[PDB]
Write a protein that binds this DNA or RNA. Structure first.
Lengths: 104, 81, 111, 82, 74
RNA sequence: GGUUUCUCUUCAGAUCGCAUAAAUCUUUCGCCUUUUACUAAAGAUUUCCGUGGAGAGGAACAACCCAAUUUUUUGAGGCCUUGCAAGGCU
């Protein structure tokens, strides 16, 4: 029926060596820091685009003191990456947002 | 190593009663119990064969010369055996 | 026992390998269900590539993200087998043929 | 032969001639015994002594007896269910 | 197995020793072996009369040791 | 007592499937003469290519060693007084 296989470890090392042209050279996960699925989900929900990443259609589609510009200390700008990383801190209204894996 | 011995070591730190081969009765805290039943205890009350009591700070009784020990009832309530 | 053998460096090497290499045993998979390039577009596009290729990477990631969002687990339904029903009839016979031979028949019969 | 009587209520006779009755829960190589809900009797083992059945009975509780000082054992009553 | 008795705590302390035969002596622990045989220094026999007599440094065989009691704090 | 291999029934919780299609309906969008065919997001419901657990029947391949202290190879027996028990004894 050819349904299950079990191999010995020299077999697996030979196959692993022969397949290396198609395989990645990453050992851990941190390469995909803001490039994982959860970052892309959050990005889609906030209508923001990571620079390499996909772009979608938006999900969501007055004079005030809280938003005033005389009170702001513009030290660094807030990038879009920061809003993906700490979504509840840098967004008013985060709906359907996913928290990303912090670090391994 | 015997099943009763493991249960004895379990009573270390508890108040226990010990009768010797000569019938003197020692009640107090079990500090150390060895494999051969050698027993170190503290703050003892001893009740002799005549009925009289005394008080001792520190004692050590040889296992062979122990007739028996009473352990806390709560501690007993081993199951696998 | 020795401290290490010939297999030791390789056996340690397989602990940090990507799937399915990291395992000893498994179920055989369908040939089509193994993309083999999914990891290439899940990484950053290399530097210096032209605009069409850079955009290409974004589109492949887009479809990857939409499949992952929209997924709901499979509904447990009464399966039916079409070919087993055909083979139960006396009208369908069965044989073993070369793939090219069968392919030619498919072409002729469709015509 | 020992494992059979485990969990049962058992009448144990000591070398000085005391009677220890308790629930037989454990033993070992030396015949050191673990006796739950154990009482000690001195004067008699009653067979329905019309005068009284129980004199010099003492409640002990959870007892570990050393095998050196054990002589013999018989079945006194069935296991308590608890 | 071939265990030591746990007596290092009692080393060089004054002790009260109850022996078989209703015998009692007092002295300073100077050493021991796996059989619980003891070396006791400045030993004194506490005669049943109440009178006490100095016997010096002695060996007590662990066999005949019923009980010991420290006269010090360990 | 086993393994392999076909057909059927039933239950599917599990990344049911380290993969991924289509259709229908409702909302919003983009196309702009009308309808096919459509653009792209959300939600709901189906179909299709595959899978897992359990049960029944058929066929094929293998087989009926511890007596010298701390326990179990003994400090073991004998005398006196009172109401077997306690104590003093040898």
């Amino acid at each position: 029926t050819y349904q299950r296989w079990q191999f010995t470890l020299p077999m697996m090392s030979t196959l692993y060596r022969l397949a290396n042209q198609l395989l990645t050279d990453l050992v851990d996960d941190n390469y995909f820091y803001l490039f994982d699925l959860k970052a892309f989900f959050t990005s889609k929900a906030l209508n923001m685009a990571i620079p390499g990443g996909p772009k979608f259609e938006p999900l969501v589609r007055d004079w005030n003191e809280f938003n005033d510009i005389n009170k702001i200390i513009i030290r660094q700008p807030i990038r879009t990456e920061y809003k993906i990383a700490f979504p509840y801190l840098y967004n008013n209204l985060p709906h359907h947002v996913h928290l990303t894996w912090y670090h391994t | 190593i015997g099943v009763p011995i493991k249960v004895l070591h379990e009573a270390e730190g508890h108040i226990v009663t010990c009768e010797t081969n000569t019938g003197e009765v020692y009640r107090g805290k079990l500090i150390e119990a060895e494999d051969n039943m050698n027993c170190q205890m503290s703050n003892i009350t001893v009740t002799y064969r005549d009925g009289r009591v005394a008080q001792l700070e520190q004692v050590y009784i040889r296992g062979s010369k122990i007739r028996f020990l009473i352990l806390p009832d709560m501690l007993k309530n081993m199951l696998k055996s | 026992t020795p401290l290490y053998t010939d297999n030791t460096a390789n056996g340690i090497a397989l602990l940090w390998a990507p799937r399915p290499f990291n395992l000893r045993s498994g179920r055989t998979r369908r040939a089509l269900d193994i993309p083999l390039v999914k990891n290439w577009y899940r990484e950053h596009c290399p530097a210096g590539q032209p605009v069409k290729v850079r955009v290409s990477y974004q589109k492949l990631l887009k479809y990857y993200v939409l499949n992952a969002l929209k997924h709901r687990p499979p509904k447990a339904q009464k399966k039916r087998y079409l070919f087993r029903s055909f083979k139960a009839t006396k009208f369908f016979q069965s044989t073993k043929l070369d793939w090219v031979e069968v392919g030619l028949q498919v072409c002729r019969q469709g015509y | 032969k020992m494992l059979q009587h485990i969990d049962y209520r058992m009448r144990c006779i000591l070398q000085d001639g005391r009677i220890f009755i308790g629930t037989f829960k454990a033993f070992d190589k030396h015949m050191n015994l673990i006796l739950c809900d154990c009482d000690e009797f001195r004067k008699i083992k009653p067979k329905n002594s019309k005068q009284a059945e129980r004199e010099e009975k003492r409640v002990l509780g959870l007892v570990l007896l050393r095998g050196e000082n054990l002589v013999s054992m018989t079945v006194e009553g069935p296991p308590p269910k608890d | 197995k071939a265990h030591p008795p746990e007596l290092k705590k009692f080393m060089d302390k004054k002790l009260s020793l109850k022996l078989n035969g209703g015998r009692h002596v007092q002295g300073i622990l100077r050493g021991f072996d796996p059989f619980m045989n003891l070396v006791i220094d400045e030993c004194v026999e506490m005669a049943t009369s109440g009178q006490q007599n100095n016997i010096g440094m002695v060996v007590i065989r662990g066999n005949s040791i019923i009980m010991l009691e420290a006269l010090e704090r360990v």
